[PDB]
């Protein structure tokens, strides 16, 4: 199946690998590129798994994995149809090369010194240029680690097609599902499950340690506004909640909180962050970043002379913003594409800043860029939403911008229901100016109000 030598070898079959393959092929039109993917599926995008796939009213959505965007346009979760790819076997013999995906195969050893790697079935493959695009694995909760296998079996860690399938089936079978975690993924799943639950009259609970949803990223006002919005989707939200233990009590899961509260439920979804997939650093003799996690790479995403790293697993040097590790779709696309350019001699640093988005249904959306963290100083500027200011229409307060500052300069921006303005946010961050008045900068985002106390 696997050829013995491949020029370009990409480890992991996700978003960063797909983008690098595309980039390599655009820059070297006869290039021969092999993606080694431990999953059985060809490369696909994750965002719809917590969003549009749940809003489909086609009962075969779980089989088709096609969805409608908020504006009604239908598409596949897969980046390309299967016919786009060439077989791994044909890859050395096909005139003008191509991209092949070896599915169901895991790279288990990296022998950097010999430009060679080993698969789980013992096959060995040599390369000229290699990209590590291994992503991450969801973290669990130590309280759940400590509980039995019975609790573990009724806890979902949500990241793939198989998890969407299993959880979707669970939502049709049980009466109560509890999401643990207040981040964007937990909050997206809450709204998705809350929507499903209204048709059946069942319950969705969300609990997290912070005062409100996305508390680690959004300042207080907007975090609180968001918690109230999730509640309006028919979710019972429980802020200020730290899990002490989880057990089974009379068939039910019983979550005990540190404050003495107890929550009975049928199933748990644990959305408490990602562990970057760095097992290959050991055999590879590659450095892991002890501050941010992931493989430590430079401004050009390079680890060693013929090894790059992109996507969720790459801790990189941002010449403007400092060392970072980002776990976002567009970042996987941007960093995968850049690695591909650098693998074909571009020698370019990360410059173009990647973006983030989240939707809580067709009516509420966030976009963000740069360094966004609720511990940084912030300035928020808000206004009443017009008709156009929701994810669907783009494709008392209801919208606004939040500037995140360091050394008096904007280093991150969150846009709340403001669409088609990311280029402006990216420019503000790039220019690094000390703004005399951020209410005047907010006018760049079509927010036009008198100054308000804060």
Ligand X SMILES: Cc1cc2nc3c(=O)[nH]c(=O)nc-3n(C[C@H](O)[C@H](O)[C@H](O)COP(=O)(O)OP(=O)(O)OC[C@H]3O[C@@H](n4cnc5c(N)ncnc54)[C@H](O)[C@@H]3O)c2cc1C
* Binding residues for ligand X restricted to 311-350, rule: CB under 6 A: 311-313, 327-330, 332
Return the closest-CA partner of residue 351 out of 365, 362, 363, 341.
341
Residue 184 annotated as part of some ligand binding site: yes
3-state secondary structure of 242: coil
Confirm whether residue 448 is marked as ligand binding.
no
52 binds ligand X (CB under 6 A): no
CB of 336 to ligand X, least distance (A): 7
Q: How far apart are CA 82 and CA 67, in angstroms?
A: 18
In the bound state with ligand X, the residue whose beta carbon lies nearer, of 188 and 389, is 188
> Does 133 sit near ligand X (CB under 6 A)?
yes
Give 360 or 401: the residue with its C-beta nearer to ligand X. Answer: 360
Is 117 annotated for ligand binding?
no
Cβ-contact 178, 262 below 8 angstroms: no
Least Å distance, CB 365 to ligand X, is: 10
Torsion of CA 15, 309, 30, 115, to 10 degrees: -140
Alpha helices per DSSP H over 66-206: 142-146, 149-152, 161-173, 184-200
Determine if 39 is a binding residue for ligand X (CB under 6 A). yes
- Interacting residue with ligand X among 7, 135, 183, 294 (CB under 6 A): 135
213 belongs to the binding site for ligand X (CB under 6 A): no
Q: Of 127-135, 169-177, 228-236, 428-436, which segment contacts ligand X by CB under 6 A?
A: 127-135
The answer on whether 15 is annotated among ligand-binding residues is: yes
Other beta carbons within 10 Å of 410: 22
Closest to 197 measured CA to CA, from 238, 237, 233: 233
420 is in an annotated binding site: yes
Starting at the earlier edge strand, list the strands of the sheet with 295-296.
295-296, 314-318, 322-325
CB of 79 to ligand X, least distance (A): 11
Residue 371 or 441 with smaller CB distance to ligand X: 371
First to last CA, the chain: 63
Per CB under 6 A, the list member of 6, 32, 37, 441 interacting with ligand X is 37
Q: Which of 46, 129, 154, 296 binds ligand X (CB under 6 A)?
A: 46
User: Do 32 and 92 contact (CB within 8 A), yes or no?
Assistant: yes
- Sequence-separated (6 or more) residues with CB below 8 Å from residue 193: 54, 167, 171, 177, 179, 204, 235
What H or E segment, with its residue span, contains residue 16?
A: helix 15-27
Residue 122 annotated as binding site? no
Minimal distance, residue 161 CB to ligand X, in Å: 10
134 binds ligand X (CB under 6 A): yes
Please, are residues 132 and 296 in contact by the beta-carbon 8 Å criterion?
no
Residue 216 assigned to a binding site: yes
Among positions 2, 8, 9, 12, the unique one binding ligand X when judged by CB under 6 A: 12
Cβ neighbours of residue 386 closer than 8 Å, sequence gap 6 or more: none
Take residue 196 and report the two structure tokens written for it: 């499903």
Minimum separation from the CB atom of position 18 to ligand X (A)? 8
Which residues between 275 and 304 bind ligand X (CB under 6 A)?
A: 277, 280
DSSP-assigned beta bridge partners for residue 74:
68
Which one, 19 or 227, has the nearer CB to ligand X? 19
Is 259 marked as binding a ligand? no
The answer to whether residues 412 and 371 touch, using CB atoms and an 8 Å cutoff, is yes
Q: Is 331 annotated in some ligand binding site?
A: no
Binding-site residues for FAD, in ranges, read 12-16, 38-39, 46, 51, 107, 159, 312, 328-329, 357
Binding-site residues, in ranges, read 12-16, 38-39, 46, 51, 70, 107, 159, 182-185, 210, 216, 273, 312, 327-329, 357, 367, 420
Residue ranges binding ligand X (CB under 6 A):
11-17, 36-39, 46-47, 49-50, 106-107, 133-135, 158-159, 185, 277, 280, 311-313, 327-330, 332, 356-358
């Amino acid at each position: 199946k696997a050829p013995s030598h491949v020029p370009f070898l990409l480890i992991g079959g996700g978003t960063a690998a797909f983008a690098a393959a595309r980039s390599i092929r655009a820059r070297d039109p006869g290039a021969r590129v092999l993606i080694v993917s431990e999953d059985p599926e060809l490369p696909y995008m994750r965002p719809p798994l917590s969003k549009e796939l749940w809003f489909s009213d086609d009962p075969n959505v779980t089989k088709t994995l096609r969805f409608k965007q908020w504006n009604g346009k239908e598409r596949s979760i897969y980046f390309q149809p299967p016919s786009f790819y060439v077989s791994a076997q044909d890859l050395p013999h096909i005139e003008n090369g191509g991209v092949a995906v070896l599915t169901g195969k895991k790279v288990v050893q990296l022998d950097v010194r010999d430009n060679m790697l080993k698969l789980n079935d013992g096959s060995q493959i040599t390369y000229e240029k290699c990209l590590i695009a291994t992503g991450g694995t969801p973290r669990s909760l130590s309280a759940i680690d400590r509980a039995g296998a019975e609790v573990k079996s009724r806890t979902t860690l949500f990241r793939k097609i198989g998890d969407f399938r299993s959880l979707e089936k669970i939502s049709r079978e049980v009466k109560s599902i509890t999401i643990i975690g207040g981040g964007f993924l937990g909050s997206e799943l809450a709204c998705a499950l809350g929507r499903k639950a209204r048709a059946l009259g069942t319950e969705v609970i969300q609990l997290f340690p912070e005062k409100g949803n996305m508390g680690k990223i959004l300042p207080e006002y907007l975090s609180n506004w968001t918690m109230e919005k999730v509640r309006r989707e028919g979710v019972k939200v429980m802020p200020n909640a730290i899990v002490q233990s989880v057990g089974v009590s009379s068939g039910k899961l019983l979550i005990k909180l540190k404050d003495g509260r107890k929550v009975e439920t049928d199933h748990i979804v644990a959305a408490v962050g990602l562990e970057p997939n760095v097992e290959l650093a050991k055999t590879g003799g590659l450095e892991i970043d002890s501050d941010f996690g992931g493989f430590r790479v430079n401004a050009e995403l390079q680890a060693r002379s013929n090894i790059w790293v992109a996507g969720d697993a790459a801790c990189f040097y941002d010449i403007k913003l400092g060392r970072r590790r980002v776990e976002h779709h567009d970042h996987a696309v941007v960093s995968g594409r850049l690695a591909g350019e650098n693998m074909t001699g571009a020698a370019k640093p990360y410059w173009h800043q990647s973006m983030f988005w989240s939707d809580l249904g067709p009516d509420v959306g966030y976009e963000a860029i740069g360094l966004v963290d609720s511990s940084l100083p912030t300035v928020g500027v808000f206004a009443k939403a017009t008709a156009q200011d929701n994810p669907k229409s783009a494709t008392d307060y209801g919208k606004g911008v939040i500037f995140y500052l360091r050394d008096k300069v904007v280093v991150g921006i969150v846009l709340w229901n403001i669409f088609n303005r990311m280029p402006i946010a990216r420019k503000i961050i790039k220019d690094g100016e000390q703004h005399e008045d951020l209410n005047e900068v907010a006018k760049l985002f079509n927010i036009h109000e008198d100054l308000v106390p804060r």
